[PDB]
Structure formats: C-alpha cells, structure tokens
Design a protein around this ligand. Structure first.
Ligand SMILES: CC(=O)N[C@H]1[C@H](O[C@H]2[C@@H](O)[C@H](O)[C@@H](CO)O[C@@H]2O)O[C@H](CO)[C@@H](O[C@@H]2O[C@H](CO)[C@H](O)[C@H](O)[C@H]2O)[C@@H]1O
Ligand SMILES: [Ca+2]
Length: 147
C-alpha cells in the first residue's frame, strides 16, 4: 500500500512511499521507534529495502528533524567500524567532511564507532558518535517508487 503524491505541477509524475513512510524529494523516510543495536537496526532497514539514513545536504538534514523528538537519539547510517576516523555511509557514498553536522567536539572517541543524531540545548540538532551495542532508535531511507 503506497501513498502517492504529485511532484511539481507535472501530472504523470507520481512518487510513492509505503504509508507509514514520509516523503522528501527523491526519497522516503521511516522512523523506527524500537530500541536496537546499530547492527540490528541496519538489518531492520535491509528487509524494508532500505538503509539507515544518509545525510548529504543541509536541507535533507533539516527535513529529517521535523520528524524527530528532541528527547530522543536516532541512529544514522554512518560508522567507523575500526576506530580509525575513516567514516563510512551504509550506501557507499563518499564522506565529505565539509558537509557534515557533528556537534562541537564530536566525534570524540575512537571506541564510539556509530553515529546518532540528537538534540542539545542551543547547538540544536547534530551528530555524535556512541557505542553500537547500546540500543537506540533509527531512521531509514529509501528511494521513492514511481508510477
Ligand atoms: C549528550 C549526549 O549526546 N548524550 C548521549 C551519550 O553521548 C556520550 C558521548 O558519545 C558524547 O560524546 C558525550 C559528549 O557530551 O556525551 C556522552 O558521554 O551517549 C549515550 C549513549 O551512549 C546517549 O544515551 C542515549 O540517549 C537516548 C535519549 O537521548 C536514550 O535515553 C538512550 O537509551 C540512551 O542510551 C546520550 O544521548
Ligand atoms: Ca561521542
């Protein structure tokens, strides 16, 4: 069961998400309020035909927080599996540090090898590295279905 919207004034352009997902541009976003490790959460999206969310742009980043609660922490699809400060996205796109959104003095721990987005007074939203086994919520992202 897809939900379909007319992108722009063009009429044969219908993009679609499965009902619970929400749309922004070319992609669909789902917030998983269950509490699981990073590993499990990405496998959770892997079924759904998705990955953990990847943030390339400030506008994407902005659209995303409109769906989040500030009292919460959500896994990103961004890690450093070997603690070498060599960051990877789960979708195999490049990691451009000139367009990231870490909190001040994050990342701050070679032992913390996943990344969450969360809310800090005044800094607002931003990224922080934490421990994988520590169960958290997650955001998933896939490409929209077209019809
Ligand atoms: C302030 C903050 O981000 N706290 C989270 C904490 O961060 C660590 C650390 O990675 C960070 O660099 C440092 C800088 O001040 O602060 C802390 O030491 O990491 C934990 C998990 O390891 C997060 O806890 C999670 O928070 C959720 C709600 O926001 C929820 O309660 C989860 O159950 C909880 O594990 C901190 O948010
Ligand atoms: Ca950290």
């Amino acid at each position: 069961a897809l939900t379909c919207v007319m992108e722009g004034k063009d009429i044969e352009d219908w993009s679609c998400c499965p009902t619970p997902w929400t749309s922004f541009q070319s992609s669909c976003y789902f917030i998983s309020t269950g509490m699981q490790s990073w590993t499990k959460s990405q496998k959770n999206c892997s079924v759904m035909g998705a990955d953990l969310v990847v943030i390339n742009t400030r506008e994407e980043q902005d659209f995303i927080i409109q769906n989040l609660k500030r009292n919460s922490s959500y896994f990103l699809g961004l890690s450093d599996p070997g603690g070498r400060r060599h960051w990877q996205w789960v979708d195999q796109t490049p990691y451009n540090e000139n367009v990231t959104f870490w909190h001040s003095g994050e990342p701050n721990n070679l032992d913390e090898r996943c990344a969450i987005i969360n809310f800090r007074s005044s800094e607002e939203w931003g990224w922080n590295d934490i421990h994988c086994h520590v169960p958290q919520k997650s955001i998933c992202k896939m490409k929209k279905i077209y019809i």
